Amino acid sequence: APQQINDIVHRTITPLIEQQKIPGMAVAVIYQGKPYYFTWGYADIAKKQPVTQQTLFELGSVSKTFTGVLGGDAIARGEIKLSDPTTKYWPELTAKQWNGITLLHLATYTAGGLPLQVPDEVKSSSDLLRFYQNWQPAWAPGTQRLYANSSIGLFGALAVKPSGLSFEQAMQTRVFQPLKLNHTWINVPPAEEKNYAWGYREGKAVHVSPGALDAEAYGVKSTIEDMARWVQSNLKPLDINEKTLQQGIQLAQSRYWQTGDMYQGLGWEMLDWPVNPDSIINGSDNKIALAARPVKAITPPTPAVRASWVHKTGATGGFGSYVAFIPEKELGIVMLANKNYPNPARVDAAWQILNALQ
Numbered sequence: 001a002p003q004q005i006n007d008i009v010h011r012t013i014t015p016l017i018e019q020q021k022i023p024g025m026a027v028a029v030i031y032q033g034k035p036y037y038f039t040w041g042y043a044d045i046a047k048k049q050p051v052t053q054q055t056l057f058e059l060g061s062v063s064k065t066f067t068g069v070l071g072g073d074a075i076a077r078g079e080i081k082l083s084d085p086t087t088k089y090w091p092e093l094t095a096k097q098w099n100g101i102t103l104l105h106l107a108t109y110t111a112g113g114l115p116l117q118v119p120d121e122v123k124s125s126s127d128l129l130r131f132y133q134n135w136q137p138a139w140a141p142g143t144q145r146l147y148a149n150s151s152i153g154l155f156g157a158l159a160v161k162p163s164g165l166s167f168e169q170a171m172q173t174r175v176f177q178p179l180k181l182n183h184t185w186i187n188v189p190p191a192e193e194k195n196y197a198w199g200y201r202e203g204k205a206v207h208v209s210p211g212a213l214d215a216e217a218y219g220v221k222s223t224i225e226d227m228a229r230w231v232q233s234n235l236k237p238l239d240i241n242e243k244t245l246q247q248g249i250q251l252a253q254s255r256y257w258q259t260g261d262m263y264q265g266l267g268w269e270m271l272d273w274p275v276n277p278d279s280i281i282n283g284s285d286n287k288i289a290l291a292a293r294p295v296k297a298i299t300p301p302t303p304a305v306r307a308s309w310v311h312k313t314g315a316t317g318g319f320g321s322y323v324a325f326i327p328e329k330e331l332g333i334v335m336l337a338n339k340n341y342p343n344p345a346r347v348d349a350a351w352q353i354l355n356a357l358q
């Protein structure tokens with residue numbers, strides 16, 4: 001890699017790892033469209049297995065960027081419209097509070113207070129219907145953004161219904177395969193488990209547990225190489241030969257709502273570039289990112305703006321992830337770690353690196 005990249009990555013990430021006690025980490029810096037890879041530490045501490053460019057990490061909520069793009073691809077196929085009512089795809093959702101809640105609301109956390117998590121006791125399709133049938137909104141739809149796995153998770157499950165495919169099959173056929181993300185998995189196959197890093201929480205090795213709508217909201221695992229290719233695909237959608245997927249990538253970066261200086265896409269979130277670094281750093285703290293905030297609609301949604309900072313945080317019990325990129329600059333970063341450490345530390349490090357290379 002260019003010396004300037006090696007230098008800034010060492011001076012930023014090695015101290016981050018020292019400060020946060022991260023056991024293993026992989027970073028890709030995309031500079032002028034090309035990825036440069038860096039690894040540190042161990043995927044499995046007790047086995048002394050190093051992190052490599054083939055190590056699988058839990059992406060956590062970064063999974064929502066795949067869900068948003070798959071939803072965009074369905075829009076581009078004419079299979080769904082964001083203005084469609086939820087009940088078009090789930091007519092058994094007969095409770096009156098669902099009148100007026102659209103796929104857009106589900107995708108963008110604006111349905112009126114769907115909760116952060118689907119309850120752990122939801123184990124069957126019957127449980128899931130009961131959950132949504134009994135949920136009572138705190139706000140009218142399209143007025144407040146409250147980040148929620150139960151919201152975008154339902155969006156992903158319903159967006160694939162017209163295809164007749166399961167969510168996993170749709171994602172594999174329509175997103176992973178065309179983009180050659182051949183080491184990205186909703187369910188890690190047995191032959192690939194050797195590459196699956198352990199997450200570390202309070203010193204103990206952990207993997208994410210199964211849960212309702214997990215694939216849609218937080219369940220994807222991937223390598224640093226596939227995640228760099230995911231960033232390249234979102235930086236340069238016109239390089240994608242499949243027109244519906246090219247368009248789905250673009251639609252996931254459209255701006256549907258604004259609150260403060262942030263814009264909500266499908267999975268992705270965006271700010272105008274140049275960005276105020278303190279806004280992205282401070283805004284990533286869970287106390288802020290997860291709070292209910294009023295939104296203003298953008299109608300029509302702003303088509304993807306090249307001069308944007310586009311990003312997403314993610315975590316599981318044992319992992320912490322961050323992806324950010326700037327289309328106009330062909331510049332991006334992926335940071336995958338097997339410890340969940342605070343979002344602001346991730347974003348600060350990412351901005352120090354990308355700011356140094358702009």
Ligand SMILES: *C(=O)N1C[C@H](NOS(=O)(=O)O)CC[C@H]1C(=O)NOCCN
Binds near residue numbers: 060217314315
């Ligand atoms: C995503 O990783 N999520 C949802 C929510 N996202 O906040 S973020 O990581 O800062 O963007 C916080 C919790 C977290 C999870 O739900 N992770 O999955 C673990 C099992 N629920």
Ligand SMILES: [Cl-]
Binds near residue numbers: 010011
């Ligand atoms: Cl140094």
Ligand SMILES: [Zn+2]
Binds near residue numbers: 010011014
């Ligand atoms: Zn040093």
Ligand SMILES: [Zn+2]
Binds near residue numbers: 183
């Ligand atoms: Zn392989």
